[PDB]
């Protein structure tokens, strides 16, 4: 399924309030996002009803403010995108496992209950 693009902070705010398992792809540019978007479209289909995936083009001047609000760091030269996971309306973690269909699907289906302490 299509990965929808968000630019307006109010729209991300609404998404995070209404969906409890959200992956946001923050990209340096539309071109930088291409390969990730191709894969994520298939992941989104596989997790329909369980997870929501969207993207923000931080290269877009009108989206820069949103990327800053969300604490995105795309400053490193070898980093094209950042994948952030939001659980129950708040930032949970940067995605840090393999960027593959099976891995991302399993991540979105895995319970992440409270820390052991």
Author numbering: 28 to 144
What does the article say, verbatim?
Human protein disulfide isomerase-related (PDIR) protein, also known as PDIA5, was originally identified from a human placental cDNA library. PDIR is the only PDI composed of an N-terminal non-catalytic domain and three catalytic domains. Interestingly, replacement of the non-catalytic domain of PDIR with the substrate-binding b'domain of PDIA1 increases the chaperone activity of PDIR to PDIA1 levels, but decreases oxidative refolding of α1-antitrypsin. This suggests that in a fashion analogous to other PDI proteins, the non-catalytic domain of PDIR plays a key role in binding substrates and chaperone partners. Here, we present the crystal structure of the non-catalytic domain of human PDIR, determined at 1.5 Å resolution.
